[PDB]
């Protein structure tokens, strides 16, 4: 057997997919020696995070690294990753509680562009598994990096709301990803769940996703959220760009829509006025 999500993105296991692409991850710290991602992820010197809330906070590496380690595994993990040949570079913009700032994210996006200009490699994919309120400056920085030729993928947000009220979800040039479950339905998360609406480009597996756990060097855990869904699309984009490296952003977006499974989501889950605005697409690899 295979994790449900990897079976779902397979049209009805590439061992080195996405090798021409570098995926930048802006997230928490990562456990770079975890067997699932060791050697595949390069930890940059970049760190820009706010102080944790509560004066008695205990900074335990296993807890601090949880979010980012799981997402690095979803993208390129040896056993459970989508694009097993993709190289990753991590930047720390989220603290041990998963909180960051718009300013830290802006400085991180600038660091990525500066790094690219100093030592260019192949096509770049930037994964932003985070969200805040609508931000003019964050949308602008994302638009400028996309216009410079970099592919950006972001989480739609986990607020069961219109993604246009959040950033970078609301930036049109960024590929915005909602989450679906094993029944191909939108993911519920407590009393909230995946965002929806016209700012979402497509959905991808985002519930009970097996990936690297920072509890131990060989541990695995299931996680849910639009971050996990965005990580699937970053992996699929790395695979598509490695197969066709000359694709422009517009062409890549066309490929993602073309190969997605269509009309499998029950639109009744979304609010009435959002059904015609939300794309009924679940991401999948090309055959």
């Amino acid at each position: 057997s295979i994790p449900w999500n990897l079976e779902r993105i397979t049209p009805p296991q590439p061992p080195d997919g996405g090798s021409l692409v570098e995926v930048y991850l802006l997230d928490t710290s990562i456990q770079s020696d975890h067997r699932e991602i060791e050697g595949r992820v390069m930890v940059t010197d970049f760190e820009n995070v706010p102080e944790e809330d509560g004066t008695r906070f205990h900074r335990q590496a296993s807890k601090c690294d949880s979010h980012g380690t799981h997402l690095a595994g979803v993208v390129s993990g040896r056993d459970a990753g989508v694009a097993k040949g993709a190289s990753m570079r991590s930047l720390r913009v989220l603290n041990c509680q998963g909180k960051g700032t718009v300013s830290g994210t802006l400085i991180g996006l600038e660091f990525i562009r500066k790094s690219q200009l100093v030592q260019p490699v192949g096509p770049l994919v930037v994964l932003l598994p985070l969200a805040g309120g609508y931000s003019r400056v964050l949308n602008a920085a994302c638009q400028r990096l996309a216009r410079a030729g970099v592919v950006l993928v972001t989480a739609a947000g986990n607020f069961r709301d219109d993604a246009c009220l959040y950033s970078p979800a609301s930036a049109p040039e960024v590929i915005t990803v909602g989450a679906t479950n094993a029944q191909d339905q939108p993911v519920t998360l407590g009393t909230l769940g995946t965002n929806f609406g016209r700012c979402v480009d497509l959905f991808a597996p985002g519930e009970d996703i097996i990936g690297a756990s920072s509890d131990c060097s060989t541990c695995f855990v299931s996680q849910s959220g639009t971050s996990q869904a965005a990580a699937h699309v970053a992996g699929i984009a790395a695979m598509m760009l490695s197969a066709e490296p000359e694709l422009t952003l517009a062409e890549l977006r066309q490929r993602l829509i073309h190969f997605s499974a269509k009309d499998v989501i029950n639109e009744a889950w979304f609010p009435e006025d959002q059904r015609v605005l939300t794309p009924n697409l679940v991401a999948a690899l090309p055959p």
Partner: peptide, 10 residues
């Protein structure tokens, strides 16, 4: 899938 394992479950 849901769970936690000390090795790759599949």
């Amino acid at each position: 899938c849901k769970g936690w394992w000390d090795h790759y479950p599949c």
